[PDB]
Design a protein around this ligand. Structure first.
Ligand SMILES: [Mg+2]
Ligand SMILES: [Zn+2]
Ligand SMILES: [Zn+2]
Ligand SMILES: [Zn+2]
Lengths: 97, 1405, 85, 134, 107
DNA sequence: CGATCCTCTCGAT
RNA sequence: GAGAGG
């Protein structure tokens, strides 16, 4: 059954942050993607079981992170990249200055 | 589900939007992509080294993927690249390209106005990567030249080239010089250069987004998971549109590569160049300015990535904001008298499909073993056992399914069991009460059963409705449901600061029937009724009657269901403590003393049993009170019976005769008025037509008749009448229903008027032309009992249809309103500093609701100091110890006689009194009309009543208190009512402010004389009350984490859905025609510049406002009057002799107008005597006004005001004949005789007004008020005779422009409030205040639209979730925006715990 | 950095409904996963009813980090926070 | 019987009040095209196939169809068909997952193109239950 | 304070700020016939000092941007003659608390 | 560029 | 796409 926007809204009003996350992740999608620490893109060549990762272009091999997002969000970010848009996902609030 | 990763787990804290460098696309790439063909290379079953696969994901569930391996459901897919032969544009960026092109010089490659221009200097200074560029473009788009050098001469970089007048054509650009088309490779060369300093000023980022990157050089090739295959038949292909379009762009690219390094036909090469562009761009976005797309064996056109993300069933709305979920269930719903309020009846098959993942602990191991032993087919069972490693053991197939020796740390996916928290829901979810947590109760049968008293929040009925159930899959997720979402926690709602659940239907009906003084019960039934109550003490109450037979009253046995320490007092109309009619309500210690129990006591009412019991006993006890009352009443009623038949619609032979004559007299009123209208005797009132006046009268007579006939019927109905019985209880039906079924259905309306002449001059071809009679225009004389005639039948069907048509509209329209409201306020929440803030950290309110109180902990309380006379106030609050008649009697105090005289204690009583008189003045300045009842936290009356019972106060003995005990006691209590806590002055004054009105209430209720003479409290009881107020006040405060934006949105939105009729019920008078309901609510929210009903409401000079004459004068002074409005006809005669008329009537005028050259052409106007009298006009005024226009170039003569026919004669002081006909136009159309422009119609109205009398009390003192059609606030407010202090307009945009943002805000609230109030609905102040403040905080009026709120400084991922999805995302990349990920939407998109309630703080060790 | 000292805390000395729910939930999760129990369960088995007991007897060893809109936080212990509600 | 519910007499339901028959026809044809490539109505076994539904095919006769009078429920395959992939590929038709009843009539005919085409009628008797609308 | 009666030429409009630190404020006589500040709907606005603004921002841990806003050409801001950056305190009557203080910043 | 929610069934490409 | 359900 669809847990639409309107239902998403009632969970916010109740302030049920975890239940709302669970509906949108554990029930439904939820996917583990590998992110580059430099470009912050889903570039990272997931070479599991052989402990290798690496992001070509960035010449990165150590600065890698794993995020838990909906497959639909992963799909979206890829579709934005398909339209030449960079949805750079960063793991630290760092606004540097 | 996926493998283990060594890489550290972290959430997303920022989203840096940007643009891909072609060099970055090539670097990121894994595949070359040279071939347009799929995978079949000359029949061979593999993949081609061109399109899809060459190192980027398998499409055959093969663990192989270019060394990375992983296989599907683990591989994210990898990006490949494609080298474009010649540069191409981007569909979305096309507009930005042209805009950037009108800012930079072609050849030169530099910005046009740096940095001497005293416009561009100010424009450059503005902080924004969008609002800066907005000013810049507008400034240098006018420029046609690069400029050699600049003024103080000052020489700088600037060539001598004329900038083209760029124009967009199809999907290309055309430049005008004073010609030649603009090349995609040409535009790049300019953009490739620019300047890092200059370009960052025009909204770009050196790192993330450059304008040279808006043009495509290298296109990113999406992997197969983005564009997957798989069909219905396993013999053919079945490719994605995206794949077909990428093959199409490749065919176009290889063609261009061929032609370039082959015979280039000069102009024929550009025919293939324009087609490569109509592919690259059309794959990203179809549905543009040019043409659509092709078949390609599939259902034409191609969707494109743009369409994929486009809202409502699109990637954002349909997949991210909402999505289909597991652990969900659905069915038809049924009521259950025998189910607890917080319960839900779950069909056994559903309980057996849905599971909970329980970890094996020593506390459950025995129960889990047994459940695993029962398996998936026997109810308290399970399907699946998960061990270490994560392997699921399928209990329905495993050979070891009957073996299984559980181990701690394993999980058992057990069936849904009794008492599990579940989320129960009914769509549409307009409320948070539409989605509540219930306790599972596994039952036989295929429906979901629910307690009847939960029907209202869900807006559920059992006529086929279906509801949804969601299962929490985590311990914390179950806690969230049980501790925040539970049904008992929702009983008293913040929407309208009152219960949203109450006793309904059979229970509401039988509770009345049971409660009658006449209703008595015998032992046998009593015993059964008592046992039916689960909380029963086992003690048989002593029967009301002990004489020939013990006989218990209904009130007695129902009081068993009411818990102890419950006090309730009411008073209806004739209620007098001896309650003759058995009306009102008096409950002491949960025993009903008097008062028939109905809707006012036991419904969703404000200060009823339910609101009281929740506050007094608690939510868990209140939810038992539902069942307890249901159980007794349902049983008593089951044994009593209740019906309704045709006989209940029948009134007396005599009543019918009286109804029949009531209608015939109405029929004559309409005839007399008709006959009068037709004789030209009926005079029309100022502001309305003779025909409008007639229609208004006829409809009133006709409505009067239905109401009079109906009241005649209602009176005739006996108390044994079943319809009357249901109306008395308040379970179903109202007056109308009785009237329409028994007496007369009445007038039918379409578009607020009686039945229109759909045929020429008649409503039906059974009538003659020009028939305005009741029967002819839709008056249903008959009742549903008597039956309707065909004419009546048709007309009723016409009226009926208008209802179904707007029902259908006032659902899709309100649904859209609700969405917009929710989206705009989504992110507003109460922070840890009691502040009200959005995702940006911007302040909306400094204290939530202005008092920092939770709406569900607030109730309407009287402010005792505001009302009454100055003498009544004195008698109530004054204590003069230095007066023998005005002290406290020694029977009120232990110190009574010891204090008479005093002096030192009178300084304290004078301090007490002065603050009370100060309060009275203050309240009268806040609440001008003198309304005392206001929603405030802490019910003082209830606390007082509780101390009275708890301490067993005897109103005979004197109190042990002191003036100091009372006066200082109350004073210290005030210093303890915390809403805020900071030791600073800003915060201390904010705290002082928040608690002002409550301290008023408190002082009025806890004054010395009241505490002593009225309440008669002891020191014991007084000190308990003092601590109870402090504790309940502190409980009443809003909790930081409260999602008030969504609350407000839903609190306004929900009632709007329930707004019945777009046409207002003001059907009597035709001058009451102001836009209301959903059309108005839409005008307000969209901030419509062109509203349907703009209106000024004019209050006269304070004097002087009772003067009916002064009102008529201000009306004619302000109502716009032109010459057209007073003129019958205008004529042009040839009267050559200026002092001798050709017109014999005019002779007398020419005799005069000589003492105290021209033209032989006369312009002669005839004026209307009545119109001149309706307006405050005299010929002299009209004449001197014509005279003061053309002055010397026209000669004006006129007839006297007494002179029979009103005439104005004009003359012009070759080619003359036309000039005069031209003048007449200006004379009529362009001349103001008197009045204010835009103010069309002004009407005089007598308004009621509560004003303080010279003795203190509020008195009704009526006042003449002017009501306008049209608006000119600025001009009307300066008219003498008005009260410029009280002038009002429903055009809040004008109040904003004239008076400022704060007055605009107050007027915007008044507006929103009125829409809600006109519908009879009530919404708490704080919800509409929050809306109005949000629309206001920017200094202007920001609409709840894509234009309004959606264009603000908020996160790109949160804006795209609303509307204009793709375009928001395109400008985000181009401007190289950063998203905080501080908003709800970005966290929903990220599948992360949002900083809302539960996640609005961190939990550490 | 950032942090407010114990002395200078201006947020409610009262536990919010959202704090209590998240507290009880987190602790329920722990107990559900064979974590040690800081109170004598008197025939109690449901992880939540146990967490409710540990809350009632103030034996929950957790700290609520209260963020203010600038980014500063106030650390409050379950032990110190008053449970009215 | 509140908020639009109703109380129905079980005894009169036992005597037949508001009881109804329910019929559902399932259709299939042997292919759409293929000069040599033709789908077949048969009871499918191994023959490398593995693309089976199961839902027991066990109620099917050698023609790939169930005889009228057999009780069907769950996802029991009612029409057995294969697509020739050059071994077999499953094209069998299961009974609606939620439905059950008795095979009523089984029609074997030919289309205008000469296509062996079948219609299977299944029969349920629906007795008035708790969430039924009247 | 220049009090014009009918209109100002846009030529004269481009001479208004050309002489700082002094300020020139133009008001149409017609706009001043009625003092807007006396209207029911207009609450009291208090131009708070540079130091008061400093304390306000400190006390609520704010940025100028995070504060509710008032337009330069706002009828009330013009009456008070507010400059951009200046903060005004709006003390208004409240049905909820009696008294409520909001704050707006000039733009 | 917007145009209630959710739910079902059907037929046809 | 249409028909429907609350
Ligand atoms: Mg319904
Ligand atoms: Zn990288
Ligand atoms: Zn891979
Ligand atoms: Zn140049």
């Amino acid at each position: 059954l669809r847990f639409g926007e309107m239902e998403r809204d009632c969970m916010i009003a109740h302030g049920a942050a975890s239940f709302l996350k669970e509906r949108l992740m554990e029930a439904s999608d939820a996917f583990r993607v590998h992110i580059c620490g430099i470009c912050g893109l889903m570039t990272v060549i997931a070479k599991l079981n052989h402990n290798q990762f690496e992001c070509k272009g960035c010449d990165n091999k150590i600065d890698i992170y794993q995020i838990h997002i909906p497959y639909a969000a992963k799909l979206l970010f890829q579709e934005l990249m398909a339209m030449n848009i960079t949805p750079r996902l960063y793991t630290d609030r760092s606004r540097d200055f | 589900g996926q493998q283990y990763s060594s890489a550290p787990l972290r959430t997303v804290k920022e989203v840096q939007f940007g643009l891909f460098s072609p060099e970055e696309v090539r670097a990121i790439s894994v595949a070359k992509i040279r071939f347009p063909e799929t995978m079949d290379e000359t029949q061979t079953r593999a993949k081609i080294g061109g399109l899809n696969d060459p190192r980027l994901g398998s499409i055959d569930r093969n663990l192989k993927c270019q060394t990375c391996q992983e296989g599907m459901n683990e591989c994210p897919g990898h990006f490949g690249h494609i080298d474009l032969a010649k540069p191409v544009f981007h569909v979305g960026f096309i507009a930005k390209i042209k805009k950037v092109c009108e800012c930079v010089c072609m050849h030169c490659g530099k910005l046009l106005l740096d940095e001497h221009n005293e416009l561009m200097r100010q424009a450059l200074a503005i902080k924004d990567s969008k609002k800066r560029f907005a000013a810049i473009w507008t400034l240098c788009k006018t420029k046609m030249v690069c400029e050699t050098d600049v003024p103080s001469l000052v020489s700088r970089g600037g060539c001598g080239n004329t900038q083209p007048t760029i124009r967009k054509d199809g999907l290309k650009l055309v430049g005008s010089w004073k010609l030649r088309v603009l090349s995609t490779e040409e535009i790049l060369n300019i953009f490739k250069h620019i300047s890092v300093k200059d370009f960052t000023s025009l909204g770009f980022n050196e790192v993330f987004s450059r304008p040279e990157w808006m043009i495509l050089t290298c296109l990113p090739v999406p992997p197969p998971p983005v564009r997957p295959s798989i069909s219905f038949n396993e013999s053919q292909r079945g490719e994605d549109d995206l794949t077909f379009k990428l093959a199409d762009i490749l065919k176009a690219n290889i063609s261009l590569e061929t032609l370039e390094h082959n015979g280039a036909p000069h102009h024929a090469i550009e025919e293939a160049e324009s087609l490569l562009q109509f592919h690259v761009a059309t794959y990203m976005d179809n549905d543009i300015a040019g043409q659509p797309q092709a078949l390609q064996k599939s259902g034409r056109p191609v969707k494109s990535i743009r369409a994929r993300l486009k809202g409502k069933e699109g990637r954002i709305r349909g997949n991210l904001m909402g999505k289909r979920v597991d652990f969900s269930a659905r069915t038809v719903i049924s009521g259950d008298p025998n189910l607890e309020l917080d319960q839900v009846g779950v069909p056994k098959s559903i309980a057996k499909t849905l599971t909970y993942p329980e970890v094996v602990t020593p506390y459950n191991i025995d129960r889990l073993t047994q459940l695993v032993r029962n398996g998936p087919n026997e109810h308290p069972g399970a399907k699946y056992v998960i061990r270490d490693s994560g392997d699921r053991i399928d209990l329905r197939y495993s050979k070891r399914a009957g073996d299984i020796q559980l181990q701690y740390g394993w999980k058992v996916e057990r069936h849904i069991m009794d008492n599990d928290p579940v989320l129960f829901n009914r769509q549409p979810s307009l409320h948070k009460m539409s989605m509540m947590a219930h306790r599972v109760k596994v039952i036989p049968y295929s429906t979901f059963r629910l307690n009847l008293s939960v029907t209202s929040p869900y807006n559920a009925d059992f006529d086929g409705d279906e509801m949804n159930l969601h299962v929490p899959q985590s311990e914390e997720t179950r806690a969230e449901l049980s501790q925040l979402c539970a049904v008992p926690l929702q009983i008293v709602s913040p929407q309208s600061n009152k219960p949203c659940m109450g006793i309904v239907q059979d229970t509401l009906c039988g509770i009345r029937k049971l409660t009658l003084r006449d209703t008595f019960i015998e032992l046998d039934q009593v015993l059964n009724m008592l046992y039916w109550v689960p909380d029963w003490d086992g003690v048989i109450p002593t029967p009301a009657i002990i004489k020939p037979k013990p006989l218990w009253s209904g009130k007695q046995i129902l009081s068993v269901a009411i818990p102890n320490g419950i006090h309730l007092q009411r008073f209806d109309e004739g209620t007098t403590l001896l309650s003759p009619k058995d009306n009102g309500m008096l409950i002491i210690d949960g025993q009903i003393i008097f008062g028939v129990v109905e809707k006012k006591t036991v419904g969703s009412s404000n200060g009823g049993l339910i609101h009281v019991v929740t506050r007094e006993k608690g939510p868990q006890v209140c939810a038992k009170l539902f069942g307890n009352i249901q159980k007794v009443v349902n049983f008593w009623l089951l044994h009593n019976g209740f019906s309704t038949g045709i006989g209940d619609t029948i009134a007396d032979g005599p009543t019918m005769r009286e109804i029949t004559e009531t209608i015939a007299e109405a029929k004559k009123k309409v005839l007399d008025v008709t006959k009068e209208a037709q004789a030209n005797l009926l005079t029309a009132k100022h502001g309305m037509t003779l025909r409008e006046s007639f229609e208004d009268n006829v409809v009133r007579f006709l409505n009067e008749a239905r109401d009079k006939a109906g009241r005649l019927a209602e009176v005739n109905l006996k108390d044994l009448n079943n319809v009357k019985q249901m109306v008395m209880a308040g379970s179903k039906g109202s007056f109308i229903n009785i009237a329409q079924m028994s007496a007369c259905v009445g007038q039918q309306s379409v578009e607020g008027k009686r039945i229109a002449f759909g045929f020429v001059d008649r409503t039906l071809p059974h009538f003659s032309k020009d028939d305005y009679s009741p029967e002819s225009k839709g008056f249903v004389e008959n009742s549903y009992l008597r039956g309707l005639t065909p004419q009546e039948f048709f007309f009723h069907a016409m009226g009926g249809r208008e209802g179904l048509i707007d029902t259908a509209v006032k659902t899709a329209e309100t649904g859209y309103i609700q969405r917009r409201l929710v989206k705009a306020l989504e992110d507003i929440m109460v922070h840890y500093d009691n502040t009200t803030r959005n995702s940006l950290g911007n302040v909306i309110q400094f204290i939530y609701g202005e008092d920092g109180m939770d709406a569900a902990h607030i109730e309407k309380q009287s402010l005792d100091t505001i009302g009454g006379s100055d003498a009544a106030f004195e008698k109530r609050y004054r204590v003069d110890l230095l007066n023998t008649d005005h002290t406290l009697d020694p029977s009120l105090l232990e110190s009574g006689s010891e204090i008479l005289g005093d002096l030192k204690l009178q300084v304290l009583l004078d301090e007490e009194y002065k603050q009370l008189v100060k309060d009275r003045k203050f309240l009268r300045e806040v609440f001008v009309d003198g309304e005392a009842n206001w929603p405030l936290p802490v019910n003082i009356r209830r606390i007082i009543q509780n101390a009275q019972q708890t301490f067993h106060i005897d109103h005979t003995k004197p109190s042990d208190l002191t003036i100091k005990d009372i006066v200082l006691g109350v004073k210290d209590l005030q210093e303890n009512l915390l809403v805020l806590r900071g030791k600073n002055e800003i915060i201390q004054n904010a705290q002082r402010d928040a608690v002002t009105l409550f301290c008023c209430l408190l002082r009025s209720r806890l004054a010395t004389r009241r505490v002593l003479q009225e309440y008669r409290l002891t020191k014991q009881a007084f000190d308990w009350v003092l601590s109870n107020i402090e504790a309940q006040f502190l409980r009443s405060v809003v909790h930081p984490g409260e999602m008030v934006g969504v609350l407000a949105a839903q609190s306004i939105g929900e009632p709007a859905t329930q707004m019945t009729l777009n046409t207002f019920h003001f059907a009597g008078v035709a001058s009451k025609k102001v836009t209301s309901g959903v059309p108005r609510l839409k005008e307000i929210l969209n901030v419509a510049k062109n509203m349907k009903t703009p209106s000024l409401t004019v209050y006269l000079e304070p004097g002087h406002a009772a003067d009916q004459e002064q009102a008529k004068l201000i009306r004619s002074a302000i109502e716009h009057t032109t010459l057209k409005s007073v003129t019958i006809a205008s004529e042009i005669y040839y009267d050559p002799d200026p002092r001798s008329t050709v017109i014999p009537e005019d002779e007398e005028i020419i005799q005069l107008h000589f003492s105290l050259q021209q033209s032989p052409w006369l312009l002669r106007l005839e004026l209307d005597r009545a119109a001149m009298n309706d307006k405050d006009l005299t010929m002299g005024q009209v004449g001197e006004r014509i005279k003061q226009t053309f002055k010397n170039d026209l000669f004006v003569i006129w007839s006297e005001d007494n002179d029979e026919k009103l005439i104005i004669r004009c003359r012009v002081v070759a080619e003359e004949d036309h000039m005069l006909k031209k003048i007449e136009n200006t004379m009529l159309e362009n001349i103001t005789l008197r009045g204010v422009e835009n103010i069309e119609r002004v009407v005089m109205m007598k308004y009621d007004r509560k004003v303080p009398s010279p003795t203190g009390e509020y008195v009704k003192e009526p006042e003449w008020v002017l009501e306008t059609d049209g608006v000119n606030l600025s001009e009307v407010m300066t008219v003498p005779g008005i009260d410029p202090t009280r002038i009002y307009t429903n055009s809040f945009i004008d109040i904003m422009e004239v008076l400022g943002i704060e007055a605009g805000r107050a007027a915007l609230y008044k507006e929103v409030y009125n829409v809600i109030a006109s519908d009879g609905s009530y919404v708490n102040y704080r919800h509409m205040a929050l809306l109005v403040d949000v629309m206001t905080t920017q200094g202007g009026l920001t609409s709840v639209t894509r234009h309004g709120f959606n264009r603000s400084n908020t996160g790109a991922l949160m804006r795209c979730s609303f509307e204009e999805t793709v375009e928001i995302l395109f400008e985000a990349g181009a401007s190289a925006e950063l998203d905080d990920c501080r908003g709800v939407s970005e966290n929903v998109i990220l599948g992360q715990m949002a900083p809302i309630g539960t996640g609005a703080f961190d939990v550490m060790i | 950095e950032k942090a407010i000292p114990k002395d200078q805390r201006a947020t409610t000395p009262y536990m919010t409904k959202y704090e209590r729910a998240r507290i009880l939930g987190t602790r329920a999760l722990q107990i559900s996963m064979n974590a040690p129990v800081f109170v004598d369960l008197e025939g109690e088995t449901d992880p939540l009813r146990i967490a409710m007991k540990e809350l009632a007897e103030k034996k929950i060893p957790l700290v609520i980090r209260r963020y203010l809109p600038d980014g500063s936080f106030e650390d409050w212990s379950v032990e110190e926070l008053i449970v009215d509600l | 019987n509140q908020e639009d519910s109703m109380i129905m007499n079980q005894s009169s339901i036992d005597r037949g009040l508001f009881r109804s028959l329910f019929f559902r026809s399932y259709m299939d044809q042997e292919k759409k095209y293929g000069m040599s490539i033709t789908e077949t109505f048969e009871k499918p076994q191994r023959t490398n196939t593995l693309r089976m539904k199961h839902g027991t095919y066990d109620k099917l006769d050698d023609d790939g169809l169930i005889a009228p009078g057999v009780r069907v429920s769950g996802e029991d395959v009612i029409i057995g068909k294969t697509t020739p992939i050059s071994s077999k590929r499953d094209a069998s038709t299961p009974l609606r997952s939620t439905e059950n009843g008795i095979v009523d009539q089984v029609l074997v005919t030919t289309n205008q193109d000469g296509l062996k085409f079948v219609k299977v009628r299944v029969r349920t008797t629906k007795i008035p239950q708790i969430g039924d609308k009247f | 304070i220049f009090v014009y009666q009918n209109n100002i030429t846009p030529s004269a409009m481009k001479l208004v700020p050309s002489i700082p630190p002094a300020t020139i404020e133009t008001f149409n006589e017609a706009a001043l016939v009625v003092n807007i500040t006396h209207h029911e709907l207009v609450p009291k606005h208090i131009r708070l000092s540079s130091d008061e603004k400093r304390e306000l921002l400190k006390r609520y841990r704010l940025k100028e941007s995070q504060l509710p806003r008032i337009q330069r050409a706002d009828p009330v801001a013009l009456y008070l003659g507010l400059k951009r950056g200046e903060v005004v305190k709006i003390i208004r009557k409240s049905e909820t608390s009696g008294r409520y203080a909001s704050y707006r910043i000039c733009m």
